[PDB]
Design a protein around this ligand. Sequence first.
Ligand code: GFB
Ligand code: GFB
Lengths: 356, 356
Amino acid sequence: AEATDPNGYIVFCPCMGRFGNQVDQFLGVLAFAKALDRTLVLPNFIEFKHPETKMIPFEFLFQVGTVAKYTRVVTMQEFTKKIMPTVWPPEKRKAFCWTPRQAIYAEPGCHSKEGNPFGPYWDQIDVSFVGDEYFGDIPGGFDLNQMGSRKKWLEKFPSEEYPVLAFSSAPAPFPSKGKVWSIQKYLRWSSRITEQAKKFISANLAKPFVAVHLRNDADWVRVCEHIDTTTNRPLFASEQCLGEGHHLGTLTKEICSPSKQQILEQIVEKVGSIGAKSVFVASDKDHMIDEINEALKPYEIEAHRQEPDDMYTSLAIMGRADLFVGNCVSTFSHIVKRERDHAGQSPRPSAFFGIR
Amino acid sequence: AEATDPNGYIVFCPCMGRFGNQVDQFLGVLAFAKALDRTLVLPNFIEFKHPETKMIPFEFLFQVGTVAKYTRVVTMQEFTKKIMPTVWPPEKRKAFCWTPRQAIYAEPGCHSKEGNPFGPYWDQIDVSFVGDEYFGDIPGGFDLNQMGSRKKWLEKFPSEEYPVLAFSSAPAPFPSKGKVWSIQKYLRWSSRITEQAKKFISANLAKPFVAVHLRNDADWVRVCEHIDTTTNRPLFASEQCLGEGHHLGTLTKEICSPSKQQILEQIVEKVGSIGAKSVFVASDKDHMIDEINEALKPYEIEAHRQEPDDMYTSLAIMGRADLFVGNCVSTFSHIVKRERDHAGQSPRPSAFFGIR
Ligand SMILES: C[C@@H]1O[C@H](OP(=O)(O)OP(=O)(O)OC[C@H]2O[C@@H](n3cnc4c(=O)[nH]c(N)nc43)[C@H](O)[C@@H]2O)[C@@H](O)[C@H](O)[C@@H]1O
Ligand SMILES: C[C@@H]1O[C@H](OP(=O)(O)OP(=O)(O)OC[C@H]2O[C@@H](n3cnc4c(=O)[nH]c(N)nc43)[C@H](O)[C@@H]2O)[C@@H](O)[C@H](O)[C@@H]1O
């Protein structure tokens, strides 16, 4: 690709949060790239592994062919090898953020490589920045939500001088707007992940199966404990079950953090509802395999988990489930819901804990 | 003050940079508070002292009476004691920033108390935040530069629900826009600082005197070394000598970082130009007292510095000088220029190194 895009490129660090947060932003980055009509450089996703920061190529997890059906993309590999040499030489590498900020960890700026995963991400692809540009004065920043905003991007950063818009963090709302959720149709698991999910299913999961997502780490309970039921504002992915602006009801700590009793009761019920012959559990911590097996011991079915627990293949398995029960607050669960809603010709059944 | 402002308050951390950066932003914060018609809580200015972060009350450095002639203000002391108890109880304390960000040093947010001086600043006045609000979707953020922007602030954050807009960093452009520079008229040194400046002057500085600002730390030379004379964009305070958008000429490393020879030559010349009987030197590091004294040894005058070097009183002394020669890039020098331009009925003479 020595003939490059006359419109230029967007590259970004999915520098906020873990895989759920990253995917939730990436959907908005797709819609932003599409609107600007610049080619999107597909990110390396980030996985934290005490004390390694691991960059995972887009194409290891998801298929490029499929995402290309939404908008014009190149892989990070393509970008660094075929594109960067001729359109983005070291002296043109500027980072983009809302406003200059004070370094924590020295001239005011974006500080795109301060801290983790910020520095490792750009180090991975040999990028250092020589300057910062700011987009705060464009109405709504990267939203493209207000009149003149797209024009302003095009006016202020035209591709001739700015062939690459390089963003310190994903230029997208978090949590994602309802209007980007259907874009998850264009995220299809790689052959590797699908093979592994199918293998696990044939080896462990008598059909039909219920897949459940259990989010229960100490840090999660503590954010759930902060729910203000009177103000009732969105929290992370909560609009996935409660609708936009929470117009369907009230978010409670029972929804955010279902009790062990609530979980078992609901799992027992869902198993009965479809005549399930197995249960799959994905969790950040406690899979509750024993508690669930005791609860399902009457039905003569069992719960199964991945050993060790591969988050990406767990996501794939849950997307394949006959029935999925998720956590409505979690953006991890939200990946599953969007895939089940949008991946095929018709919605695959999904439920959430604490909601009926 | 148990009868509080129906329009509400703005409080902020001058969380970016040292005293120059802080004052340069504070001018814009004044204009922003004035435009919104909310009472401004005067900050504690921040001084870093390996390893103490020191908060200095506004009123120790500058006079409240004078700043009150620009817009409605209360001191931090007033705020915490008379205002906060009735209008801003712990459960209403929300921080305001452009957009949610990833913590470096855990839910996405403003992270208003992560790091130094961020945490110490709010700890000083016993504030913890229970929530974040974002203003990125208001066109130009805090600029008030675009149509509907002020209305949007008033619409989105009306004083009833939001009696206090508390900003993680100063809601103002950096570097400051030309249109806020005259606001420096309303920053008058406290009695303490003026007494000390007058004492030093009577004890050491035979009139008329030339005051010079010498900025020459290792970190400063290194930013100067980055000047792109072909693109010629503003750098920190450079528009103070080169006009807005650098329409008067080109910024060079000679202006940014005058050589030792350039400094002496120019000082010798300025001394001759007004028949100076002494020289005052303020510097971040090397005062060059010996080099200057050798250069002035023919004229039978000497250079004097403060021992130890009080930045605030040095600023006051330079504002009082018969002639001031500054560094055009430095926001520290810019405080002096603005004061000399605006404090009295008529401009007091100022020059910059490398420009004539
Ligand atoms: C507290 C908030 O939580 C939000 O988390 P939430 O939406 O659940 O979704 P994530 O952003 O993915 O954060 C949850 C992370 O925890 C691990 N995790 C959660 N569930 C599973 C699982 O079933 N299997 C495996 N292997 N790992 C799991 C995984 O690394 C995942 O990316 C964040 O997005 C916000 O940034 C914030 O931190
Ligand atoms: C590199 C950039 O430099 C910019 O500095 P610049 O405009 O000179 O102005 P300041 O933001 O004040 O940073 C310079 C600081 O260094 C010390 N300093 C400089 N001159 C003197 C002096 O004459 N006497 C004393 N006692 N101290 C001095 C002082 O603490 C002052 O606040 C920053 O605003 C930016 O944030 C960035 O760091």
